[PDB]
Symmetry: C2
Subunit: 101 residues, 2 copies
Amino acid sequence: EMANRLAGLENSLESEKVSREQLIKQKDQLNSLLASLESEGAEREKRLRELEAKLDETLKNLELEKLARMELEARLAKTEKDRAILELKLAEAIDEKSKLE
Amino acid sequence: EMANRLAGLENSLESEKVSREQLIKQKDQLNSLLASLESEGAEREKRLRELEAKLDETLKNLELEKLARMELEARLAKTEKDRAILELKLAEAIDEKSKLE
């Protein structure tokens, strides 16, 4: 009776062994997965942080440049107008001269 | 022997089913972890993809506005120079009018 309980206990021990080995292999794979994903994530968060800074900077610059552009379109119109005004005044003068001939 | 060897193996089997409960538990925690990290990573990659698109756009824009601004700086200098030459010409003419009279 007892030599039997002996055989069955060993049997039960071996079945617990196969289970144990299955779970440990599964765990190893999860741990590797884990480490990997962590590393990957570290790299991407660093990369993301960099992208963010770059978009902020570029954004600033785009803004500064729009102001600058507008300021110049204005300055240019003012100058263009003055230039036109002078050509007209010039004509007027070369003519008052002409007529004084 | 036999009776002893028995209660013995029952002890062994005992601690081992306990260990197995534990591995199952650690495994479950790992798997949950894995799901979370993967979801988190999916999100971060989505956000990264978005930032990249935005950075490309803004970069284009920065470039175009920079060309526009340089074109204007040039245009403005040319105009200012012509205006200066015209003020001079003007003076010269209002003076030729003066002397003439």
